[PDB]
């Protein structure tokens, strides 16, 4: 279930072990653009929120 462009849902993710390797590995995920960060270093960073 995904909402429209307006009144979009917001999910807070915190206190968990992140693993971005399972994100860009999917085949249909053609568009993967990042701003201010690199896709290869996503699994080595630490985010406060």
């Amino acid at each position: 279930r995904f909402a429209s462009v307006y009144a979009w849902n917001r999910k807070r993710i915190s206190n968990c072990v992140a693993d971005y390797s399972v994100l860009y590995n999917f085949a249909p995920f053609f568009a993967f653009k990042c701003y201010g960060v690199s896709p290869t270093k996503l699994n080595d960073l630490c985010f406060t929120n």
Binding site: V37, S38, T40
Partner: protein, 49 residues
């Protein structure tokens, strides 16, 4: 060097180096001016001595 990849973070490091060199050249110029001032003062002090 940890958030972004080196091939995508080269311009940031270049701009940082440029800014630091520009900030250090002004310090070198101020040091040269103050050294000339101190040299003139020391010459005057030696003449008075």
């Amino acid at each position: 060097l940890s958030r972004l990849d080196p091939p995508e973070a080269e311009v940031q490091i270049d701009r940082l180096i440029t800014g630091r060199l520009q900030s250090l050249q002004t310090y070198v110029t101020q040091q040269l001016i103050r050294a000339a001032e101190i040299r003139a003062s020391a010459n005057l002090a030696a003449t008075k001595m």
